[PDB]
Amino acid sequence: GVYDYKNFGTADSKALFSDAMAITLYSYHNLDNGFAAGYQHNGFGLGLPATLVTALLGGTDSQGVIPGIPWNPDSEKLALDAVKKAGWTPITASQLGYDGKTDARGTFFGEKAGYTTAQVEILGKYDAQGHLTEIGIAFRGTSGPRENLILDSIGDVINDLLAAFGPKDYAKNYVGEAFGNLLNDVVAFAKANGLSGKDVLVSGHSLGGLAVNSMADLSGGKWGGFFADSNYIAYASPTQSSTDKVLNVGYENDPVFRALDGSTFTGASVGVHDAPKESATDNIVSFNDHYASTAWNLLPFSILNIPTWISHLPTAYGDGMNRIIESKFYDLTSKASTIIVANLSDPARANTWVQDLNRNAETHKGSTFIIGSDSNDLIQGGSGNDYLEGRAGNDTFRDGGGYNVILGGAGNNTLDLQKSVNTFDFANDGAGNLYVRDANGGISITRDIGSIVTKEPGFLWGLFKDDVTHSVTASGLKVGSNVTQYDASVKGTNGADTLKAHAGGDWLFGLDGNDHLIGGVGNDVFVGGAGNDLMESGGGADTFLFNGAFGQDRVVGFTSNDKLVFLGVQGVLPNDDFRAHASMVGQDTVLKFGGDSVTLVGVALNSLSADGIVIA
Numbered sequence: 001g002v003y004d005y006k007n008f009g010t011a012d013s014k015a016l017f018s019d020a021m022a023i024t025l026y027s028y029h030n031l032d033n034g035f036a037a038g039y040q041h042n043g044f045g046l047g048l049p050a051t052l053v054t055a056l057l058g059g060t061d062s063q064g065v066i067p068g069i070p071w072n073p074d075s076e077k078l079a080l081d082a083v084k085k086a087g088w089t090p091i092t093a094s095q096l097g098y099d100g101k102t103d104a105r106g107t108f109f110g111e112k113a114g115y116t117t118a119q120v121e122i123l124g125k126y127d128a129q130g131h132l133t134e135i136g137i138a139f140r141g142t143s144g145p146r147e148n149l150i151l152d153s154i155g156d157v158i159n160d161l162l163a164a165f166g167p168k169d170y171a172k173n174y175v176g177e178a179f180g181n182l183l184n185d186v187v188a189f190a191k192a193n194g195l196s197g198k199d200v201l202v203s204g205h206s207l208g209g210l211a212v213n214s215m216a217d218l219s220g221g222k223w224g225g226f227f228a229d230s231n232y233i234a235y236a237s238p239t240q241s242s243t244d245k246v247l248n249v250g251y252e253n254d255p256v257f258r259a260l261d262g263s264t265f266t267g268a269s270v271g272v273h274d275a276p277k278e279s280a281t282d283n284i285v286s287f288n289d290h291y292a293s294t295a296w297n298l299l300p301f302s303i304l305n306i307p308t309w310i311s312h313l314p315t316a317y318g319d320g321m322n323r324i325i326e327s328k329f330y331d332l333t334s335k336a337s338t339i340i341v342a343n344l345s346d347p348a349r350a351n352t353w354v355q356d357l358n359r360n361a362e363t364h365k366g367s368t369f370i371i372g373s374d375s376n377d378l379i380q381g382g383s384g385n386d387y388l389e390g391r392a393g394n395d396t397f398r399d400g401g402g403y404n405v406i407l408g409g410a411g412n413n414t415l416d417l418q419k420s421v422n423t424f425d426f427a428n429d430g431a432g433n434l435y436v437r438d439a440n441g442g443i444s445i446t447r448d449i450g451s452i453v454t455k456e457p458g459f460l461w462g463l464f465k466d467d468v469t470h471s472v473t474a475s476g477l478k479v480g481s482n483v484t485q486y487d488a489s490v491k492g493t494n495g496a497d498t499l500k501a502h503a504g505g506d507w508l509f510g511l512d513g514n515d516h517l518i519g520g521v522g523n524d525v526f527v528g529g530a531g532n533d534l535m536e537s538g539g540g541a542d543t544f545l546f547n548g549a550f551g552q553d554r555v556v557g558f559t560s561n562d563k564l565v566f567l568g569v570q571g572v573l574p575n576d577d578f579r580a581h582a583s584m585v586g587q588d589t590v591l592k593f594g595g596d597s598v599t600l601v602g603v604a605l606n607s608l609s610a611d612g613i614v615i616a
């Protein structure tokens with residue numbers, strides 16, 4: 001998964017991420033809440049006020065209205081209830097033995113000149129018996145003194161800030177300067193409660209995220225090395241530490257995210273700065289009204305241009321990346337996966353297709369994950385391989401080709417093929433998968449899509465209608481009661497079956513259990529399913545399709561004109577080809593995808609070509 005961290009598995013890494021997000025949002029105390037609500041209801045026509053940028057960078061004399069920043073009067077309680085719902089309670093000064101200042105929210109403040117407006121939340125997570133089990137440190141970074149955020153233009157302010165982070169280790173030393181003594185008290189408190197460094201989660205967003213990287217960098221030498229083994233997840237940070245400790249999460253179109261290289265100001269800092277970085281998630285797109293709009297994108301992309309900070313806002317971090325976490329596709333992803341997250345206002349969502357525009361970013365490689373919202377989305381996949389997730393709402397999908405998985409989710413969902421139904425083949429395994437194969441051979445596996453919309457240029461049956469709506473049934477595609485019949489198939493059971501294709505060619509659906517699939521002289525598509533399946537070509541131009549936890553399969557009689565298709569399988573890195581997954585065991589080629597494998601019986605590895613092994 002994209003948020004894998006150290007050596008936690010997929011699941012623990014996800015629980016870790018979800019906690020980092022919760023304590024990070026808590027540190028802002030709903031700063032952007034009224035703004036996010038306004039954008040969601042109305043769109044981004046009014047753009048983004050300079051006052052919001054200065055608030056994000058400099059903090060607030062709170063809590064209440066600020067010009068151009070709509071204020072939710074329940075900002076504070078909403079935020080506190082939320083962090084608690086996530087399992088976290090602020091720890092008091094008194095619990096810490098800390099002699100310094102906390103305000104009425106229980107927030108802690110920086111300790112040295114230049115750092116006194118810096119903020120941090122110290123939170124505890126407790127088991128059902130009320131024993132402390134984890135400590136959360138959520139940095140809320142500031143630039144320093146507020147009156148310095150209006151002395152020049154907002155663009156000068158931003159530009160000067162960035163140029164100041166690297167010289168004299170300003171960004172590196174930040175947490176040591178601001179919170180050096182507080183963090184000593186945290187060590188003592190951790191130890192008295194039987195916690196070590198591994199039980200501490202450190203997070204924060206922005207200058208907060210810059211603080212997370214600072215603390216990582218300081219963790220080896222300060223506080224007796226106690227936090228060296230701590231968990232560091234930083235959101236939308238301009239900087240990256242020189243350790244291997246920090247998971248730097250951000251949107252690729254967030255102009256603050258990765259603005260600096262380490263903490264070094266470069267020629268790209270004020271432009272597009274989308275070079276790959278080891279600690280970073282490089283290719284997560286926030287598909288919001290700005291990213292989507294030609295008008296908003298007229299000016300060159302730059303942090304110095306305030307509208308672009310729309311993609312920096314913390315509410316869309318929490319909302320969008322939680323949907324990644326909840327995704328059915330989550331365990332297919334990895335750190336550099338291209339993930340497009342539906343982040344449009346209610347107005348834009350009605351008429352805008354969520355798609356990878358690849359705007360202001362290096363060329364996206366490998367498969368694309370598009371994650372919808374819980375409302376009605378319009379989702380467009382590209383001509384390569386796509387994983388499209390509708391979630392709730394009535395969603396409409398389009399896709400331009402390749403191999404795809406399309407998950408309608410709850411609701412009444414539609415796949416609009418934009419082409420004649422005569423250019424497609426439809427198969428159905430009776431277990432909720434409808435397969436859609438285009439005229440070039442590209443297969444989509446679809447679930448929970450009840451309508452297919454075709455475009456017929458000629459009259460269908462003499463009967464029907466440029467756009468034509470077919471209803472997906474157990475027995476075929478229905479218009480009223482025209483049938484487009486499913487391709488011929490043989491279906492098994494969830495036990496061990498032998499299935500035999502007819503000479504004409506059959507989709508063979510093994511399903512669960514260890515199946516024996518006997519193709520014939522014709523063109524078969526083999527779907528062994530779960531279990532360890534033995535699949536025999538039997539002649540023809542055959543396709544073998546692997547999805548999910550497909551087991552340990554054996555393929556017999558594979559030739560040049562046959563094709564393997566791996567779609568929604570484990571262990572695939574962007575632009576892996578088959579060689580990355582291939583080895584010889586005896587006279588057999590073996591392809592491994594996580595703990596699943598295909599053995600090509602009697603096939604020499606050197607005899608194979610990438611064109612017959614599709615890795616999506």
Ligand SMILES: [Ca+2]
Nearest residue numbers: 252274282283
């Ligand atoms: Ca990128």
Ligand SMILES: [Ca+2]
Nearest residue numbers: 382384386401
């Ligand atoms: Ca596609």
Ligand SMILES: [Ca+2]
Nearest residue numbers: 373390392393
């Ligand atoms: Ca949806």
Ligand SMILES: [Ca+2]
Nearest residue numbers: 390393410411
């Ligand atoms: Ca849906």
Ligand SMILES: [Ca+2]
Nearest residue numbers: 493495510512
């Ligand atoms: Ca079976």
Ligand SMILES: [Ca+2]
Nearest residue numbers: 511513528531
């Ligand atoms: Ca099977």
Ligand SMILES: [Ca+2]
Nearest residue numbers: 519520539540
């Ligand atoms: Ca065959």
Ligand SMILES: [Ca+2]
Nearest residue numbers: 529531550551
């Ligand atoms: Ca199998």
Ligand SMILES: [Ca+2]
Nearest residue numbers: 540541559562
């Ligand atoms: Ca063949």
Ligand SMILES: [Zn+2]
Nearest residue numbers: 127129130131
């Ligand atoms: Zn306990």
Ligand SMILES: [Zn+2]
Nearest residue numbers: 516518534536
């Ligand atoms: Zn056999």
